[PDB]
DNA sequence: AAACGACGGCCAGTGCCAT
DNA sequence: TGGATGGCACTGGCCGTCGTTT
């Protein structure tokens, strides 16, 4: 085993030139280190290890370090680099997977102020630098200071054009901090057992001997860092057609709600309390004031003929006045997608708001605005002109305006390569990111077809044939409830999973619960599983706590199981537990629940610890699966890539958009995801049948 | 003593009438200018035959106040003929007041 | 030197969009 | 006496920072 760090002039995006690179041996105990000349050596030195059947450990290797070193030793040594991913480790991802809760952790380091504020929660390696006490410093700060002790400027990310023994020896330092933070991490003995050195084994044994979640994750981290590199086909020419009409309709929109509503002038500014103006109690409920300290009628005296009483001085121009208070104001427009305008205009027409947040201001969202009246009829009517506004909106800065737009990310190649976080969320979920291709407005929302039908394969034209690709969508059926039998099988002996398999759970639920309709059914198991309070539940059948309350405990009486497995998970991890100014107090017997791979999967809350095994078990049958569908494909003969035969595209939770060069092969595609589906449900002894449901098509609006 | 107005008659009741004219530009959600609406009693009193004291809701009457700039409110406006002779922000005291009126008329 | 003031970088408060 | 986990776009109050006016 070895560790290992480089230095190259820029991002995996367009990175030429190889700098520096250092190579921490353990068994010969001692560093060595390459400069651009010895690029060549550096990969040969990689190559030996892979021999040996060794291991080579990078922090953040398997996004950056690894494909960095395959692309640069194309350009530069054009030779064919390809560290098998068998070989690999990654502290980041071991990182990520062992401490998956440094934002906690972490407090205590930012209050002691051993980790700056702006790494907090950072698994950069620089962040573990300072958690280890490795940390003497920063490259680009000895740099960008000594940047001023010899004249020149500084442009934002610069430090790396050039290779300079500065940075040479910064390399060492990422070494020496990525091999504490691998004692560091391999010390976990929940997923690293003592009975073996892992700093001195052979790959083989470190996957084997190992708690399976660090081969899963490290697998998972592998092939969702290809996914960010095939990325997501996309149709720029409809988007920027869709930009043009949304705008057209935003500014008729804007017009007739200034038509309605007008200009006014509103409080801005004022900063101490009016006081009443013969008492003098301070006024909380009128806008703040001003009171300038200067200002008059008359300038001051300064001439022999004023300076005791006599030729007139000179008025002021100055329009207040030394003592006299006064509201400032400002004049605005109506803006629609002020929340506080809003309100402003519809409480002056009679509405008088119900509900309120914690800061004050009256609730102004979808929910309540569809159910305001105000006897204005032209004002009524308007209300639904600022729906279509907020809608028109959110469209617009999704896809065009906002920071993160897709039409600020599309690349050069036609497709938006959208980042992804392994293991991001806490229930071992994944995180997306830069952006978002896990949140493009579904098919059933408005404007959703036309955004979902931009990213399709069908926008990738075939670099031989010049044929547009086809799509293959895929979706791990009723996964959370499947997830819920497993779980209850244990105190139910599968009585759930056979209710799942004869199919409509949701009318066995309805029958339970003894709800009106099988829709209140739906709608009430994921609120109830997932914590919902008495009265959200009452809420589904129009009713409140009362009904609320009859209808959970009706629903655990006729599925004792689940009150079970609650009862269970209850006692595992709370010791006791209270309510105090609205929040929950709670002891802890234990603050995480066992995964599907061994994991500790931390809970943050009670009522949401039953979520948190679901959503984990959901998130790493998914991780498992896509793996393995991946893995099938590939032994079959099928090859990953564009310039292949399929591209996985995105991984949404429980489903994945693969990219096919032809139909037949989307076929193989679908028919290869059950297959792997039920080889996972057999892997972990599911007590439930695990089942997925394919589709084919252009683009995503199809494919689902 | 004290004339109400609108965007309409505005015009016909500042701008030509002959004369000194003491507009006061408030708002019914103002500290200030329910304060200084006492000091304008006495005052569109006081100074009869001198000066007529004219009050304008900015919110019923949206019109006219952009068109003079209000930066603050209660904002006083002194009318001279029909131009604009000096202008006064602030809930000034009985006796500023005065001061104000007694250095332009 | 004291602030009037128009300007501007943050950041918390709200809400929406997905699973 | 609780839907959960996440990413993100907007509005608008709350300070530093400059330049400016008595």
């Given at each position: 085993?070895?560790?290992?760090?480089?230095?190259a002039?820029?991002?995996?995006?367009?990175?030429?030139?190889?700098?520096?690179?250092?190579?921490?041996?353990?068994?010969?105990?001692?560093?060595?280190?390459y400069?651009?000349?010895?690029?060549?050596?550096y990969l040969?030195?990689?190559?030996?290890?892979?021999?040996?059947?060794?291991?080579?450990?990078?922090?953040?290797g398997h996004?950056?370090?690894?494909?960095?070193?395959?692309?640069?030793?194309?350009?530069?040594l054009?030779?064919?680099?390809?560290?098998?991913?068998?070989?690999?480790?990654?502290?980041?991802?071991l990182?990520?997977?062992?401490?998956?809760?440094?934002?906690?952790?972490?407090?205590?380091?930012?209050?002691?102020?051993?980790?700056?504020?702006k790494?907090?929660g950072?698994?950069?390696?620089?962040?573990?630098?300072?958690?280890?006490?490795?940390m003497?410093?920063?490259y680009?700060?000895?740099?960008?200071?000594?940047?001023?002790?010899?004249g020149?400027?500084?442009?934002?990310g610069?430090?790396?054009?050039?290779?300079?023994?500065?940075?040479?020896?910064?390399?060492?330092?990422?070494?020496?901090?990525?091999?504490?933070?691998?004692?560091?991490?391999?010390?976990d003995?929940?997923?690293?057992?003592?009975?073996?050195?892992?700093?001195?084994?052979?790959?083989?044994t470190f996957?084997?001997?190992?708690?399976?979640?660090?081969?899963?994750?490290?697998?998972?981290?592998?092939?969702?860092?290809?996914?960010?590199?095939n990325?997501?086909?996309?149709?720029?020419?409809?988007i920027?057609?869709?930009?043009?009409?949304?705008?057209?309709?935003?500014?008729?929109?804007?017009?007739?709600?200034?038509?309605?509503?007008?200009?006014?002038?509103?409080?801005?500014g004022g900063?101490?309390?009016?006081?009443?103006?013969?008492?003098?109690?301070?006024?909380?409920?009128?806008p703040?004031?001003?009171?300038?300290?200067?200002?008059?009628?008359?300038?001051?005296?300064?001439?022999?003929?004023?300076?005791?009483?006599?030729?007139?001085?000179?008025?002021?121009?100055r329009?207040?006045?030394?003592?006299?208070?006064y509201?400032?104001?400002?004049?605005?427009?109506?803006?629609?997608?002020?929340?506080?305008?809003?309100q402003?205009?519809?409480?002056?027409?009679?509405?008088?708001?119900?509900?309120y947040?914690?800061?004050?201001?009256?609730?102004?969202?979808?929910?309540?605005l569809?159910?305001?009246?105000?006897?204005?009829?032209?004002?009524?009517?308007?209300?639904?002109?600022?729906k279509?506004?907020?809608?028109?909106?959110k469209?617009?800065?999704?896809?065009?305006?906002?920071?993160?737009?897709?039409?600020?990310?599309?690349?050069?190649?036609?497709?938006?390569?959208?980042?992804?976080?392994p293991?991001?969320?806490?229930?071992?979920?994944?995180?997306?990111?830069?952006?978002?291709?896990?949140?493009?407005?579904?098919?059933?929302?408005?404007?959703?077809?036309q955004?979902?039908?931009?990213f399709?394969?069908?926008?990738?034209?075939?670099?031989?044939?010049?044929?547009?690709?086809?799509?293959?969508g895929?979706?791990?059926s009723?996964?959370?409830?499947?997830?819920?039998?497993?779980?209850?099988?244990?105190?139910?002996?599968?009585?759930?999973?056979?209710?799942?398999?004869?199919?409509?759970?949701?009318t066995?639920?309805?029958?339970?619960?003894?709800?009106?309709?099988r829709?209140?059914?739906?709608?009430?198991?994921?609120?109830?599983?997932?914590?919902?309070?008495?009265?959200?539940?009452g809420?589904?059948?129009?009713?409140?706590?009362?009904?609320?309350?009859?209808?959970?405990?009706?629903?655990?009486?006729?599925?004792?199981?689940?009150?079970?497995?609650?009862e269970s998970?209850?006692?595992?991890?709370?010791?006791?537990?209270?309510?105090?100014?609205?929040?929950?107090?709670?002891?802890?017997?234990?603050?995480?629940?066992?995964?599907?791979?061994?994991?500790?999967?931390?809970?943050?809350?009670?009522?949401?610890?039953?979520?948190?095994?679901?959503?984990?078990?959901?998130?790493?049958?998914?991780?498992?699966?896509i793996?393995?569908?991946?893995?099938?494909?590939?032994?079959?003969?099928?090859?990953?890539?564009?310039?292949?035969?399929?591209?996985?595209?995105?991984?949404?939770?429980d489903?994945?958009q693969?990219?096919?060069?032809?139909?037949?092969?989307?076929?193989?595609?679908?028919?290869?995801?059950?297959?792997?589906?039920?080889?996972?449900?057999?892997?972990?002894?599911?007590?439930?049948?695990?089942?997925?449901?394919?589709?084919?098509?252009?683009?995503?609006?199809?494919?689902? | 003593?004290?004339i109400?107005?609108?965007?309409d008659?505005?015009?016909?009741?500042?701008?030509?009438?002959?004369?000194?004219?003491?507009?006061?530009?408030?708002?019914?959600?103002?500290?200030?200018?329910?304060?200084?609406?006492?000091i304008?009693?006495?005052?569109?009193?006081?100074?009869?035959?001198?000066?007529?004291?004219?009050?304008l809701?900015?919110?019923?009457?949206?019109?006219?106040?952009?068109?003079?700039?209000?930066?603050?409110?209660?904002?006083?406006?002194?009318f001279?003929?029909?131009?604009?002779?000096?202008?006064?922000?602030?809930?000034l005291?009985?006796?500023?007041?005065?001061?104000?009126?007694?250095?332009?008329?």
């Amino acid at each position: 085993m070895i560790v290992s760090a480089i230095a190259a002039n820029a991002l995996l995006e367009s990175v030429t030139k190889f700098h520096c690179g250092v190579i921490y041996d353990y068994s010969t105990a001692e560093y060595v280190s390459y400069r651009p000349s010895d690029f060549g050596a550096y990969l040969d030195a990689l190559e030996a290890e892979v021999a040996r059947g060794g291991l080579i450990v990078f922090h953040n290797g398997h996004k950056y370090d690894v494909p960095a070193l395959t692309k640069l030793a194309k350009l530069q040594l054009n030779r064919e680099f390809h560290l098998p991913r068998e070989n690999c480790i990654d502290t980041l991802v071991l990182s990520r997977l062992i401490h998956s809760n440094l934002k906690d952790t972490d407090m205590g380091l930012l209050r002691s102020g051993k980790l700056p504020g702006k790494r907090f929660g950072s698994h950069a390696l620089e962040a573990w630098g300072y958690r280890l006490g490795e940390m003497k410093g920063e490259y680009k700060d000895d740099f960008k200071r000594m940047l001023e002790e010899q004249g020149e400027e500084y442009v934002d990310g610069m430090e790396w054009w050039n290779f300079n023994e500065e940075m040479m020896d910064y390399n060492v330092q990422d070494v020496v901090v990525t091999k504490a933070l691998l004692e560091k991490l391999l010390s976990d003995k929940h997923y690293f057992p003592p009975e073996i050195d892992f700093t001195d084994v052979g790959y083989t044994t470190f996957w084997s001997e190992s708690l399976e979640a660090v081969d899963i994750e490290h697998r998972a981290a592998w092939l969702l860092a290809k996914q960010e590199r095939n990325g997501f086909p996309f149709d720029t020419k409809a988007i920027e057609e869709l930009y043009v009409e949304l705008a057209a309709r935003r500014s008729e929109l804007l017009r007739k709600l200034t038509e309605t509503f007008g200009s006014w002038y509103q409080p801005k500014g004022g900063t101490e309390m009016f006081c009443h103006p013969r008492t003098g109690k301070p006024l909380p409920k009128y806008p703040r004031i001003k009171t300038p300290k200067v200002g008059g009628i008359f300038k001051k005296p300064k001439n022999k003929a004023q300076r005791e009483g006599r030729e007139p001085c000179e008025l002021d121009t100055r329009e207040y006045v030394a003592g006299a208070p006064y509201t400032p104001v400002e004049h605005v427009v109506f803006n629609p997608s002020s929340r506080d305008h809003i309100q402003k205009k519809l409480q002056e027409a009679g509405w008088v708001p119900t509900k309120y947040t914690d800061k004050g201001a009256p609730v102004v969202d979808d929910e309540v605005l569809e159910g305001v009246r105000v006897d204005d009829p032209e004002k009524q009517a308007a209300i639904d002109l600022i729906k279509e506004y907020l809608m028109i909106q959110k469209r617009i800065g999704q896809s065009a305006e906002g920071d993160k737009a897709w039409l600020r990310y599309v690349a050069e190649d036609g497709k938006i390569h959208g980042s992804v976080n392994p293991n991001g969320a806490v229930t071992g979920r994944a995180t997306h990111a830069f952006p978002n291709l896990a949140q493009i407005p579904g098919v059933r929302s408005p404007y959703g077809e036309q955004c979902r039908a931009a990213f399709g394969a069908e926008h990738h034209l075939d670099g031989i044939t010049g044929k547009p690709w086809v799509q293959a969508g895929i979706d791990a059926s009723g996964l959370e409830l499947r997830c819920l039998a497993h779980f209850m099988a244990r105190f139910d002996n599968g009585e759930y999973a056979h209710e799942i398999l004869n199919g409509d759970i949701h009318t066995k639920n309805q029958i339970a619960a003894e709800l009106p309709t099988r829709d209140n059914a739906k709608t009430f198991i994921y609120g109830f599983l997932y914590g919902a309070g008495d009265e959200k539940i009452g809420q589904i059948v129009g009713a409140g706590k009362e009904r609320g309350k009859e209808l959970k405990k009706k629903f655990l009486e006729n599925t004792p199981a689940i009150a079970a497995l609650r009862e269970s998970i209850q006692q595992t991890l709370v010791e006791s537990s209270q309510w105090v100014a609205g929040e929950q107090q709670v002891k802890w017997k234990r603050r995480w629940i066992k995964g599907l791979d061994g994991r500790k999967v931390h809970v943050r809350s009670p009522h949401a610890a039953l979520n948190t095994l679901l959503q984990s078990a959901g998130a790493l049958i998914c991780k498992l699966w896509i793996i393995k569908t991946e893995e099938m494909l590939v032994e079959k003969g099928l090859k990953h890539g564009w310039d292949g035969d399929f591209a996985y595209m995105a991984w949404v939770h429980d489903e994945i958009q693969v990219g096919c060069r032809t139909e037949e092969i989307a076929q193989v595609v679908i028919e290869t995801a059950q297959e792997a589906m039920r080889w996972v449900g057999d892997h972990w002894n599911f007590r439930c049948l695990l089942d997925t449901e394919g589709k084919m098509g252009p683009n995503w609006a199809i494919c689902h | 003593k004290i004339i109400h107005l609108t965007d309409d008659s505005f015009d016909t009741d500042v701008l030509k009438a002959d004369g000194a004219i003491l507009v006061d530009f408030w708002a019914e959600w103002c500290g200030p200018c329910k304060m200084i609406a006492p000091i304008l009693d006495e005052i569109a009193d006081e100074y009869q035959g001198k000066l007529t004291v004219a009050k304008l809701n900015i919110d019923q009457n949206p019109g006219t106040a952009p068109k003079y700039g209000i930066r603050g409110i209660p904002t006083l406006l002194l009318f001279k003929n029909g131009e604009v002779a000096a202008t006064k922000v602030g809930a000034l005291s009985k006796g500023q007041l005065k001061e104000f009126l007694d250095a332009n008329l």
